[PDB]
Amino acid sequence: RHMTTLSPSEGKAQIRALLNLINTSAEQAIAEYDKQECDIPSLTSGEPHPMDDRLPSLELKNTLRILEGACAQLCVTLAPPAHTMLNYSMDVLVPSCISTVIQAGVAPLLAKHPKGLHIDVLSKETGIHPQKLATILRLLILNYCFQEVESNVFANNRLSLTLLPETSVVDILDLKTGEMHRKATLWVYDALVDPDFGPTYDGNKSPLVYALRREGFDGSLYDYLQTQPGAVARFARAMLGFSVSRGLMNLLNVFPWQELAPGSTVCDLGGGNGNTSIEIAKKFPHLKVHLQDLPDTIEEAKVFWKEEYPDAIKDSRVAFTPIDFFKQAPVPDQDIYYISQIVHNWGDEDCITLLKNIRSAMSPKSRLLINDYLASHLDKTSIANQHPSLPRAPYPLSPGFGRGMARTYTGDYTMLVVCNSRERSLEDFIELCSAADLKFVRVWDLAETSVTEFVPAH
Amino acid sequence: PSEGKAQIRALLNLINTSAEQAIAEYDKQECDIPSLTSGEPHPMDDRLPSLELKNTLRILEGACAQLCVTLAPPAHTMLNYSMDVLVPSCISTVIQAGVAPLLAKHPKGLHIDVLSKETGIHPQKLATILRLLILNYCFQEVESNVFANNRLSLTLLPETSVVDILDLKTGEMHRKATLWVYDALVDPDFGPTYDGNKSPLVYALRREGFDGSLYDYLQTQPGAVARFARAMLGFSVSRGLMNLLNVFPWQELAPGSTVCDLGGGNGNTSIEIAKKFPHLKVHLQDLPDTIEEAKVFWKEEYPDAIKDSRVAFTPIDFFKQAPVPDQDIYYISQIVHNWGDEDCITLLKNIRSAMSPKSRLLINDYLASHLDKTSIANQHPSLPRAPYPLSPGFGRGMARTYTGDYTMLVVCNSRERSLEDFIELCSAADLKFVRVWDLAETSVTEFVPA
Numbered sequence: 071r072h073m074t075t076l077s078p079s080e081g082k083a084q085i086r087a088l089l090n091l092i093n094t095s096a097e098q099a100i101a102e103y104d105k106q107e108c109d110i111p112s113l114t115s116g117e118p119h120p121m122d123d124r125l126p127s128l129e130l131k132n133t134l135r136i137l138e139g140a141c142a143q144l145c146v147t148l149a150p151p152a153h154t155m156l157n158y159s160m161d162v163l164v165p166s167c168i169s170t171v172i173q174a175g176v177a178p179l180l181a182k183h184p185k186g187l188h189i190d191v192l193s194k195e196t197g198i199h200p201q202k203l204a205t206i207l208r209l210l211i212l213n214y215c216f217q218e219v220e221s222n223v224f225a226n227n228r229l230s231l232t233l234l235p236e237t238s239v240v241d242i243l244d245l246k247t248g249e250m251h252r253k254a255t256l257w258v259y260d261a262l263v264d265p266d267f268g269p270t271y272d273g274n275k276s277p278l279v280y281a282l283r284r285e286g287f288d289g290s291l292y293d294y295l296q297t298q299p300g301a302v303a304r305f306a307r308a309m310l311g312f313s314v315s316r317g318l319m320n321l322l323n324v325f326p327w328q329e330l331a332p333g334s335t336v337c338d339l340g341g342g343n344g345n346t347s348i349e350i351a352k353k354f355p356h357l358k359v360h361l362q363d364l365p366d367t368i369e370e371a372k373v374f375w376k377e378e379y380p381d382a383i384k385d386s387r388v389a390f391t392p393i394d395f396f397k398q399a400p401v402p403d404q405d406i407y408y409i410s411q412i413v414h415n416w417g418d419e420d421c422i423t424l425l426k427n428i429r430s431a432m433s434p435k436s437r438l439l440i441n442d443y444l445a446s447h448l449d450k451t452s453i454a455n456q457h458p459s460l461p462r463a464p465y466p467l468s469p470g471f472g473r474g475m476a477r478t479y480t481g482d483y484t485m486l487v488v489c490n491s492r493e494r495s496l497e498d499f500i501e502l503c504s505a506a507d508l509k510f511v512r513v514w515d516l517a518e519t520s521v522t523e524f525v526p527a528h
Numbered sequence: 529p530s531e532g533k534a535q536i537r538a539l540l541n542l543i544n545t546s547a548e549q550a551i552a553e554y555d556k557q558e559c560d561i562p563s564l565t566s567g568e569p570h571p572m573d574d575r576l577p578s579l580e581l582k583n584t585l586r587i588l589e590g591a592c593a594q595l596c597v598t599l600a601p602p603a604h605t606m607l608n609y610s611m612d613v614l615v616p617s618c619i620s621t622v623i624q625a626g627v628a629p630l631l632a633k634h635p636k637g638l639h640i641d642v643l644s645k646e647t648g649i650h651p652q653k654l655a656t657i658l659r660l661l662i663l664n665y666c667f668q669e670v671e672s673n674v675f676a677n678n679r680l681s682l683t684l685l686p687e688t689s690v691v692d693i694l695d696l697k698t699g700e701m702h703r704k705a706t707l708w709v710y711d712a713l714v715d716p717d718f719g720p721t722y723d724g725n726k727s728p729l730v731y732a733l734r735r736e737g738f739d740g741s742l743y744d745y746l747q748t749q750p751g752a753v754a755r756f757a758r759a760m761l762g763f764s765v766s767r768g769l770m771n772l773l774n775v776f777p778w779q780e781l782a783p784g785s786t787v788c789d790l791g792g793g794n795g796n797t798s799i800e801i802a803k804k805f806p807h808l809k810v811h812l813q814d815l816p817d818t819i820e821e822a823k824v825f826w827k828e829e830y831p832d833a834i835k836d837s838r839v840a841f842t843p844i845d846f847f848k849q850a851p852v853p854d855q856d857i858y859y860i861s862q863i864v865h866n867w868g869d870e871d872c873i874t875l876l877k878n879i880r881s882a883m884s885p886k887s888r889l890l891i892n893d894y895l896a897s898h899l900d901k902t903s904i905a906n907q908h909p910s911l912p913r914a915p916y917p918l919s920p921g922f923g924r925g926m927a928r929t930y931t932g933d934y935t936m937l938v939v940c941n942s943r944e945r946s947l948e949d950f951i952e953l954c955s956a957a958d959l960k961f962v963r964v965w966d967l968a969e970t971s972v973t974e975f976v977p978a
């Protein structure tokens with residue numbers, strides 16, 4: 071129409087530019103589906119789309135960042151503030167419903183009956199009152215998870231299929247919506263102003279540990295998981311699925327592993343089982359990988375590598391060396407030292423200690439890759455003056471990608487309430503590395519976390 | 529070419545045209561587009577949102593949500609859903625910490641260290657909380673580590689008609705209501721019934737040694753009953769329920785027609801009806817103490833209606849006695865969704881027994897309709913229809929109907945009802961369904977004596 075141009079203003083120009091971002095991003099997402107020769111996904115189909123279990127392309131993830139940011143900004147601009155804030159206040163409800171239907175096994179039950187089940191059958195099988203379960207299901211269905219095929223007859227759709235026990239994402243969805251995460255957010259303010267739990271970032275003083283203490287539990291997160299049967303393996307699968315659902319394997323496509331000389335060494339410092347190094351070695355057979363972690367984890371990793379990629383052990387392309395990376399330096403003269411989701415778990419002093427340990431082991435050919443969210447400040451000046459190798463949100467998105475980069479900030483807050491740690495900005499990382507005589511090179515954007523590269527300064 | 533591509537482009541068209549019409553709604557009041565960085569309220573922030581704006585927002589939000597969820601991988605969307613507890617947690621925390629009033633006293637903005645000193649919260653932790661809110665357009669960072677209010681955080685000021693409902697919905701009691709929902713639902717005592725003392729909230733409160741209803745619990749907490757009453761009023765105001773005045777055709781009733789505000793408390797709704805439509809007479813009926821309070825309220829806010837003999841007050845227990853007879857309109861709002869079927873049918877038969885052949889009953893409540901394609905395709909023509917290709921209905925655009933129902937379950941052990949549920953109850957009370965009057969929030973369903 072003409073409503074953006076009849077009585078012109080800067081605000082109308084910004085609305086029209088948001089509309090342009092939405093339209094062009096949607097067309098680019100269509101192009102991504104065309105590139106893979108796939109049709110557009112359906113929210114009513116009862117079977118997965120071919121790309122549901124595939125690594126999302128970098129282009130699709132960047133597109134979605136812009137599309138989600140622009141849609142969110144457009145709606146929040148045009149709606150009355152009380153409307154948006156009321157909806158925010160009720161956003162706890164959908165994750166509550168997800169946890170409830172996971173506990174009730176609704177999605178596997180519906181997978182046994184793909185054409186759908188009447189709500190009385192679901193009630194008989196779950197033990198939940200049929201109208202209460204229908205209330206839960208309809209809130210999820212309104213949000214495109216499950217579907218109502220006839221009145222009071224419910225079926226799976228492509229979003230509820232992520233809740234099947236076999237998928238790679240059900241465990242992280244179960245953990246993030248689960249009772250432990252709900253306890254972590256139950257008394258956040260009280261923990262933050264508590265004279266003992268408030269002032270420090272100590273591991274045993276998170277809001278989760280505060281809630282556990284307040285209910286009579288003695289022990290940290292670790293101990294709490296150990297006391298819950300089958301919960302440590304649940305947490306491990308959840309971490310793996312958190313990496314998978316976020317498309318972190320796009321590392322393999324962003325950093326130029328193919329341009330490293332044959333025989334180059336990648337030291338996966340603190341890589342646990344080496345789930346990343348194993349993919350690097352599988353995809354780039356000209357590289358050698360070194361897994362370093364705690365001795366027990368190193369034995370688990372030897373078994374894991376024997377399971378999944380014995381060829382690397384037979385070819386002498388994988389090596390394993392135990393380490394406590396706070397007390398000893400890693401193996402020297404590696405071409406790459408890779409640390410992923412390690413810095414955001416420790417305070418500044420321990421990080422500087424680890425960074426100095428890494429720096430002491432490096433040669434002129436060495437570099438350090440840090441895989442972590444970059445939790446940038448949200449003022450216009452910080453965003454404008456960021457390093458040009460960082461992705462920049464297009465006009466008129468603000469702050470940055472807005473909701474399009476939500477997981478950087480929901481991640482940070484999660485780190486606070488569950489682990490009492492924090493994500494850091496690019497400036498924070500540069501300052502820590504500079505204290506360890508490491509000079510910044512550039513950011514390798516994964517459209518989720520970022521891989522920042524540093525080299526020995528002197 | 530493909531149906532999926534055509535649906536994506538139809539969603540784009542819905543987004544474009546709905547945004548255009550939202551702009552037209554701002555132009556109609558000679559207002560510019562609101563700003564997400566401005567430190568002062570937009571002139572329409574405290575105004576009743578027009579029916580047209582709420583309609584286009586239903587479409588715009590439903591279409592944006594459906595577009596993003598269609599194009600994103602399911603794991604991406606579900607991961608973001610799984611983290612949706614965090615923003616309300618942050619809202620509750622900044623409310624308890626008083627960040628918005630503090631920033632109101634210093635409109636330029638405050639450094640994070642000043643906010644930390646004033647709130648007792650570590651500055652980097654407070655910064656994490658604030659930045660999650662700010663990414664969602666609540667508050668803003670004007671300079672690095674210097675934060676200020678914006679138009680969304682202004683809703684958190686103590687004087688607003690929305691801060692109390694936001695405080696309640698994000699607060700500790702509501703967090704306890706969603707703590708153990710599954711366990712409550714499969715428990716053989718809490719699961720099978722809708723008894724007031726068997727809600728998921730009460731299930732969680734048992735672990736503190738409490739047992740009773742929500743009303744009992746509120747009376748154990750200092751200042752909780754008053755905060756709850758303020759929150760209910762503010763929930764009504766912030767949802768634009770006063771669009772009742774603009775949807776039901778009060779001006780098409782003949783002068784002298786009577787409106788019986790049944791269970792209307794102080795008469796907050798009927799006093800606005802009486803002011804906008806002086807040709808109507810209002811009869812307010814509620815509990816005796818409430819009726820005396822309402823007399824005081826009307827003497828303070830609309831004494832002309834008392835001088836002109838346009839408002840009457842008659843105490844009632846509407847489960848035990850019939851309302852005053854032969855009124856043109858009987859109006860009940862947010863009552864049915866608080867009671868079970870048997871009590872509702874009792875109240876409806878009481879109302880029916882008082883009606884004359886010309887009387888109508890208006891029920892204001894959410895219509896928690898079924899979401900299958902057949903129910904939606906064959907719904908009553910008076911219901912709003914979501915345009916192609918929105919599904920189910922308006923999708924996320926009508927979220928508050930379905931977050932309302934779930935809220936009623938976990939906090940109150942009650943439920944919203946579908947249109948068919950309402951029609952069946954009223955038919956059991958010898959009331960025939962006429963039509964729905966869409967408020968673009970709740971709905972007002974009309975019934976007549978059969």
Ligand SMILES: NCCC[C@H](N)C(=O)O
Pocket residue numbers: 221896897898903904907946947948949
């Ligand atoms: N016959 C099916 C009734 C479903 C109807 N749309 C309702 O939700 O009221």
Ligand code: NA
Pocket residue numbers: 173248249708710711
């Ligand atoms: Na649970």
Ligand code: NA
Pocket residue numbers: 081084147561562563564
């Ligand atoms: Na704007």
